[PDB]
Design a protein around this ligand. Structure first.
Ligand SMILES: Nc1ncnc2c1ncn2[C@@H]1O[C@H](COP(=O)(O)OP(=O)(O)OP(=O)(O)O)[C@@H](O)[C@H]1O
Ligand SMILES: Nc1ncnc2c1ncn2[C@@H]1O[C@H](COP(=O)(O)OP(=O)(O)O)[C@@H](O)[C@H]1O
Ligand SMILES: Nc1ncnc2c1ncn2[C@@H]1O[C@H](COP(=O)(O)OP(=O)(O)O)[C@@H](O)[C@H]1O
Ligand SMILES: [Mg+2]
Ligand SMILES: [Mg+2]
Ligand SMILES: [Mg+2]
Lengths: 173, 460, 512, 458
């Protein structure tokens, strides 16, 4: 898993994109570069023992969607070290760094049944005080919980499901 | 043109990357300009895309990354033939004696496949060396291998000098000396001794000295082998002297550790038994000619059991064990008669005469070993009249095995003696039969042939 | 999965320009610091073994040239360095002051005077790493270098140009034997060098004070790499001593160089190798530790006169030069099958084994003659010593063969009892006090007294007093014979007559 | 300014801005809950990361905590005000008294004195212990080491040396307890205080409870205090209670610092870690440090790398052994393995030297006979080898002595034996003038007269 080797490249690409105001273009460029890594015929090539510059130049050819200087230079640097498979993770950490810089959050709300669209407003308003960030809800429906709601925001959860209450009571005894 | 570039240098290990069309093969030789000098690298591994890991055949200092490297599209290959007699050469076949270019017609690659089991031929012609104890107790045939085992300072190197001198002078046979990990002091003494004894024009020498990187010390055995093979194809019978197998195995261990292979039994490389066979399997007598070999093998700390001597035993046909105790009592060649052995010592090959003489001598010495510890306690007069006879004859036999070498004259001033096998058998068989019971013991010491014992007894 | 010095801002630079704009290949920047190793980024043109110059006046040796890194070891205190410091690659390799004016000075591994007597007066500089003289440039060693120890000069001769290992356990007289070998050259014409690796400074101070009590310090160089100095200096210390000794060799003079505990140079090199992440072999030692000592000791040589004339461009004619080495090794519990002892026993020309069982029992120097070897042998002896010592090997050999009976000695026969009681006397004869070296005349006289049977009456408890009295007798009465032997080493029927007369008159008319 | 980014055992990683990164050996500070934790940086990794060791309990540290860069190394109080008080490794006071009123603070990382400054001193120093100053006498300003396994008496010996030297000595004294029992530190602190010698002794304790950082750096603190007293022109006593724990604490940390293991799992920098300490504990022209160091030997194996690399740093080595202590013979010193630089005829005189060499000779000849004695019994010995065995056993007994600090163990009162009075007794036993006494007449007595007396009473 490339979570740890992706961090440097994500930070470098985000800093560069920030200086030149093109964060929104860089995210699209990385999305496409990550998509070409999932291809059946390319994921075969990336595993071969090709020399780095040959692998880069044969990978660059498959993408005209990259701003010719810098977007390709990132590919070349990654290919030198043999890390082109890390792109699908450089993308996610780029998105995370962006969400941090634009102080935005995306909190899941899991419920037994859909909420009234007046409840959601209150939840979002309250979270925007729980967090400095502007929230974006993505509610869901689950039948294991059967009353209350689960609010999951990153790796912090606020659990008000009746299911959680039952299985937390059972342990008191 | 020069298609490659250096990408790493770590000590003696150099990585070079080529375009993927033209990666060198394994064991190919590359070449790079190490400043105002030339350096050849030997490819060991093709690892990854276009990159190749190599060993430098020289000092690695002064190498930059990015230098241009050129691949000679063939293994290391050395001069061969008559042109090399009397010369000294390093692993690459370059003269290190300042006498100028070699003058060779033909060059052979030092990596080649051993003879197939059907090209061989087994012929039991014993070599005659001129050393009493060796000819008698450890006979060896053409095409066979002999191992001079022992610690340090017992005589392996001067015994090999003596064998070379005899073979070159009394039998006019060519010889090759491969100095695997050679001390330059002894290499120079060997050069001056061969040229003073007037045998240099029939020896060709190869020196991988100790101050050279591991790769030089490893590949020298194959250069000596390739020269000996060229002489074999001409239909000759040559003799190949390897100055220490122990240092061949050590150079292999170092080369292995540098390339990062996972070590094995006592730090030795994994491929130890395969390197030893790659070497020892090219030394054989084929139907066209014959290579005989005699090989010094240091036994570290007297244990005969750690992998380095333990593996070589599988390949030898005779073993002569030298002892520092015997040497310290002053009876050189310092060969132990009881532990030295040979596979050829059986009647069907050496005749019943030689066989019975050898076994009789071993039996008399073995009995004197018993009687020593009674002589120590009870004094000698408590021995029978017959046992005092075994004692006197064992002491005479034990003196008679010593011999003055021609190459040892520098140590003691005494002239050397060459003893034919007939004289050896006749002398020992006479001593064991009471023919000479009237001579004093010292009449037999360092006396060469038996007829010179009766001459020496007149003067004592 | 782990990073290889790909870090945020370097990557960003490459994002903006992948083909680095041409930048100086003569400099780079430190990116890491730890335990004396720095990783430098850049330095495209660095060469292996090159000297890299750091802020301040410090240097590092470039040892690992990798794909976009140079691993280098700092020669000195490293803790001051810091990530980001710029660094330049000098074109040079390490060189050390070399000259005749170093005699009597104490200098550290870089030739900086450490005794405080002011600057040096050297004669130029010499490269610390050099190739040894070739096969054809040598000459056979046939001159003696005298240690002044009966046990060493009689049975393990050392010749000018030889390499004799001194090996034994801790605290058995390894340093003592070497410093008596040095003191004995004060009036021999051999310049001495004593290089100390990894010792504590107050031991060096003490050996220098002993070298100066006796008149020996005026004729010897001391190279110090104390236990606190960085591994690069402890590991390069022997090569600086060799580069200072080769100054005399290459000019038709004689030198003697003593490496004190090569078994600590091997350890400093192991540390350097394990910090650079090189593959460990046996006992964690790097693979190439044989090539480390091998190319060091192969500089001890005797070089023929033609090599000297070539080197000094005809300024010196007709003289051979020489350099003798006495590397010291320490074995744990007498194990000679450890990685470092197993190599140096294979490189050298001889071995002196010092044993603690002998040292405790009072036999000092504790040389063990049954397992010590000298391959040069008698070729490195004066013919009087070569003639006389030949009987001592046999005396002690028969003794070693009979020694097993010492505990039942009462039951033995008088035939072998005489050999068993002769070996003990010639063993008690080889004992000797420290700092009391013997000229070749005194050694020959005593070994003659022992070989020819004179000591047969003297009880084993009086051999020491017998020798001590014999030397004074001969000194007062027969100075003209000692002055002849010490000057010619020759042996004759006339010399034998004179000696036999001396022994008869002493043993008849004196007492001890 | 920095953030924590990893926590593995005792080592912590911290991330700083690119241009603010600390130097090696600087000290950082974290607020571990309701606590303040000090980190000492060991290495600079790439990218503003810096790797540290925690001088405290590592538990409770989250990732992302903010750490503050103090821009100086660890500094400890020093000088006369640090005298008669117990101190932490960080120089903090650990007894319940007030703050240390020090005028000056020194960094615990220093370079060893130059070769030009060293000094050499043959002035013999008497200790009322028979074996130590017969076999291995030591000098004012020299180094002594007590080598021994676990439980053989290398702390009792050090307390008796403290008694015999450090009460009869004017200058100050320092005691560093590196990785040893706190019970014994308390016992020592009260033994001092209840005899009013406490106010000339300075104490530092890094006992075995504490996490590796404390045991790792606590030796340099004691050395720093001793070096301050040395530079003032005084002469000092420095006792280190177990210097083996200073390298074991390095072995614990080494693998986490990302360094490949070496011979028996030891850090690759063992000899340098040990030398850079042992080199600053030396006397010099301006003043002298006399020291005694207890040196634990793991698994009783004297060829282990850690003991093996220490013998080279000491002038007098006293090697205790279990195969003697289990005979009840205390102090359990092995005379065939103890040694001193000072044992020369030119330093101790011909008679002392000659007695010591004769004693070694006898005991060695006795070792050589033990195998034949074990196989064939004692009756096969020559008529004079039985005499060697009898005198060797008498000498083994007479090497025993009753200490004043070991009264608690055996009741019997302590004895003090002068050098003049011990070489006489051993010369007597060797020359045969006590062959009529039984062995037990010699066990646990003072001078030879007390043996001649004990024989009357059996
Ligand atoms: N010939 C001798 N007679 C009496 N004593 C000796 C003799 N040679 C050495 N010694 C003593 O033996 C002791 C140890 O000697 P030395 O220090 O030379 O051994 P070492 O191997 O160098 O010890 P280390 O392990 O510290 O290097 C010294 O105190 C020295 O005085
Ligand atoms: N036959 C001999 N005659 C005289 N001296 C010998 C003889 N054999 C060995 N020696 C002595 O042994 C020394 C070394 O012998 P060598 O054969 O080189 O030992 P190794 O077998 O260890 O190489 C020589 O210098 C010589 O002094
Ligand atoms: N002189 C002595 N008399 C009696 N017992 C002693 C003497 N010296 C040491 N001992 C014993 O040695 C044991 C080991 O204690 P100690 O010296 O603390 O070991 P360690 O050195 O490991 O700390 C003690 O419990 C004590 O009984
Ligand atoms: Mg040899
Ligand atoms: Mg020493
Ligand atoms: Mg204790």
């Amino acid at each position: 898993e490339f979570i740890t080797v992706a961090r440097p490249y994500a930070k470098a690409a985000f800093d560069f994109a920030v200086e030149h105001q093109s964060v929104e273009r860089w995210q699209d460029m990385l999305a496409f570069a990550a998509e070409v890594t999932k291809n059946e015929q390319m994921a075969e090539l990336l595993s071969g023992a090709l020399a780095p510059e040959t692998l880069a130049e044969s990978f660059i050819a498959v993408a005209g969607e990259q701003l010719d200087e810098n977007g390709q230079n990132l590919i070349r640097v990654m290919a030198e070290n043999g890390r082109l498979n890390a792109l699908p993770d450089v993308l996610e950490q780029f998105i995370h760094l962006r969400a941090v810089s634009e102080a935005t959050a995306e909190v899941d709300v899991i419920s037994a049944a859909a909420l009234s669209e007046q409840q959601l407003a209150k939840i979002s308003a309250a979270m925007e005080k729980r967090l400095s960030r502007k929230v974006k809800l993505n509610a869901k429906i689950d039948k294991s919980v059967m009353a209350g709601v689960i609010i999951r925001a990153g790796d912090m959860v606020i659990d008000g499901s009746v299911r959680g209450r039952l299985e937390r009571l059972a342990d008191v005894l | 043109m020069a298609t490659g570039k250096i990408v790493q240098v770590i000590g003696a290990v150099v990585d070079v990357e080529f375009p993927q069309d033209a990666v060198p093969r394994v064991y190919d030789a590359l070449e790079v300009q190490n400043g105002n000098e030339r350096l050849v690298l030997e490819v060991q591994q093709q690892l990854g895309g276009g990159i190749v890991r190599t060993i430098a055949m020289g000092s690695s200092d002064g190498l930059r990354r990015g230098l241009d490297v050129k691949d000679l599209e063939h293994p290391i290959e050395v001069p061969v033939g008559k042109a090399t007699l009397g010369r000294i050469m390093n692993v690459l076949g370059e003269p290190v004696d300042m006498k100028g270019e070699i003058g060779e017609e033909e060059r052979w690659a030092i990596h080649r496949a051993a003879p197939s089991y059907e090209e061989l031929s087994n012929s039991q012609e014993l070599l005659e060396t001129g050393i009493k104890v060796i000819d008698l107790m450890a006979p060896f045939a053409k095409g066979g291998k002999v191992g001079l085992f022992g610690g340090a300072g017992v005589g392996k190197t001067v015994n090999m000098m003596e064998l070379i001198r005899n073979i070159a002078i009394e039998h006019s046979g060519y010889s090759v000396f491969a100095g695997v990990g050679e001390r330059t002091r002894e290499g120079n003494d060997f050069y001056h001794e061969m040229t003073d004894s007037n045998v240099i024009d029939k020896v060709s020498l190869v020196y991988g000295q100790m101050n050279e990187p591991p790769g030089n010390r490893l590949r020298v055995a194959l250069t000596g082998l390739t020269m000996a093979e060229k002489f074999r194809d001409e239909g000759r019978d040559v003799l190949l002297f390897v100055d220490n197998i122990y240092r061949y195995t050590l150079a292999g261990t170092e080369v292995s550790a540098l390339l990062g292979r996972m070590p094995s039994a006592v730090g030795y490389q994994p491929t130890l038994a395969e390197e030893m066979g790659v070497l020892q399997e090219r030394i054989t007598s084929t139907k066209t000619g014959s290579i005989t070999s005699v090989q010094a093998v240091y036994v570290p700390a007297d244990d005969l059991t750690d992998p380095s001597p333990a593996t070589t035993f599988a390949h030898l046909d005779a073993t002569v064990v030298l002892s520092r105790q015997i040497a310290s009592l002053g009876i050189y060649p310092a060969v132990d008669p009881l532990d030295s052995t040979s596979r050829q010592l059986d009647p069907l090959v050496v005749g019943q005469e030689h066989y019975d003489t050898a076994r009789g001598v071993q039996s008399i010495l073995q009995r004197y070993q018993e009687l020593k510890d009674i002589i120590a306690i009870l004094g000698m007069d408590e021995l029978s009249e017959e046992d005092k006879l075994v004692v006197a004859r064992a002491r005479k036999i034990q003196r008679f095995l010593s011999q003055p070498f021609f190459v040892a004259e520098v140590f003691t001033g005494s002239p050397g003696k060459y003893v034919s096998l007939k004289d050896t058998i006749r002398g020992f068989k006479g001593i064991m039969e009471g023919e000479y019971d009237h001579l004093p013991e010292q009449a037999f010491y360092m006396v060469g042939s038996i007829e010179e014992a009766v001459e020496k007894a007149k003067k004592l | 999965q782990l990073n290889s010095t790909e870090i945020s801002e370097l990557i960003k630079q490459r994002i903006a320009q992948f083909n680095v704009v041409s930048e100086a290949h003569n400099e780079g920047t430190i990116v890491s610091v730890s335990d004396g190793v720095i990783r430098i980024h850049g330095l495209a043109d660095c060469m292996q073994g090159e000297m890299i110059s750091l802020p301040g006046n410090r240097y590092a040796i470039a040892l690992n040239l990798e794909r976009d890194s140079v691993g280098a070891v700092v020669m000195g205190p490293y803790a001051d360095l810091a990530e980001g410091m710029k660094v330049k690659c000098t074109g040079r390799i390490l060189e050390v002051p070399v000259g005749r004016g170093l005699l009597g000075r104490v200098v550290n591994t870089l030739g900086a005077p450490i005794d405080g007597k002011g600057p040096l007066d050297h004669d130029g500089f010499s490269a610390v790493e050099a190739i040894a003289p070739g096969v054809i440039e040598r000459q056979s060693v046939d001159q003696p270098v005298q240690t002044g120890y009966k046990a060493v000069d009689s049975m393990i001769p050392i010749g000018r140009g030889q390499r004799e290992l001194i090996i034994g356990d801790r605290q058995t007289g390894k340093t003592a034997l070497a410093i008596d070998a040095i003191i004995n050259q004060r009036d021999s014409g051999i310049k001495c060098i004593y290089v100390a690796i990894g010792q504590k400074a107050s031991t060096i101070s003490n050996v220098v004070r002993k070298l100066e009590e006796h008149g020996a310090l005026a004729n010897t160089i001391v190279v110090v790499a104390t236990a606190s100095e960085s591994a690069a200096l402890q590991y390069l210390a022997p090569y600086a001593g060799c580069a200072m000794g080769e100054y005399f060799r290459d000019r038709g003079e004689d030198a003697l160089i003593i490496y004190d505990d090569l078994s600590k140079q091997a350890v400093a090199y192991r540390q350097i190798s394990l910090l650079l992440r090189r593959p460990p072999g046996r006992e964690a030692f790097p693979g190439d530790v044989f090539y480390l000592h091998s190319r060091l000791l192969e500089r001890a040589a005797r070089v023929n006169a033609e090599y000297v004339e070539a080197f000094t461009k005809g300024e010196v004619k007709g003289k051979t030069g020489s350099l003798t080495a006495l590397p010291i090794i320490e074995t744990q519990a007498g194990d000679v099958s450890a990685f470092v002892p197993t190599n140096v026993i294979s490189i050298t020309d001889g071995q002196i084994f010092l044993e603690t069982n002998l040292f405790n029992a009072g036999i000092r120097p504790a040389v063990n003659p049954g397992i010590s070897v000298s391959r040069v042998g008698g070729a490195a002896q004066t013919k009087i010593m070569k003639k006389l010592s030949g009987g001592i090997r046999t005396a002690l050999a028969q003794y070693r063969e009979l020694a097993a009976f010492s505990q039942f000695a009462s039951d033995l026969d008088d035939a072998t009892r005489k050999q068993l009681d002769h070996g003990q006397k010639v063993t008690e004869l080889l004992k000797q006090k420290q700092y009391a070296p013997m000229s070749v005349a005194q050694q020959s006289l005593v070994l003659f007294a022992a070989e020819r049977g004179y000591l047969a009456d003297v009880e084993l408890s009086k051999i020491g007093s017998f020798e001590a009295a014999l030397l004074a007798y001969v000194d007062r009465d027969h100075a003209p014979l000692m002055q002849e032997i010490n000057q010619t080493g020759g042996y004759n029927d006339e010399i034998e007559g004179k000696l036999k007369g001396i022994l008869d008159s002493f043993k008849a008319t004196q007492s001890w």
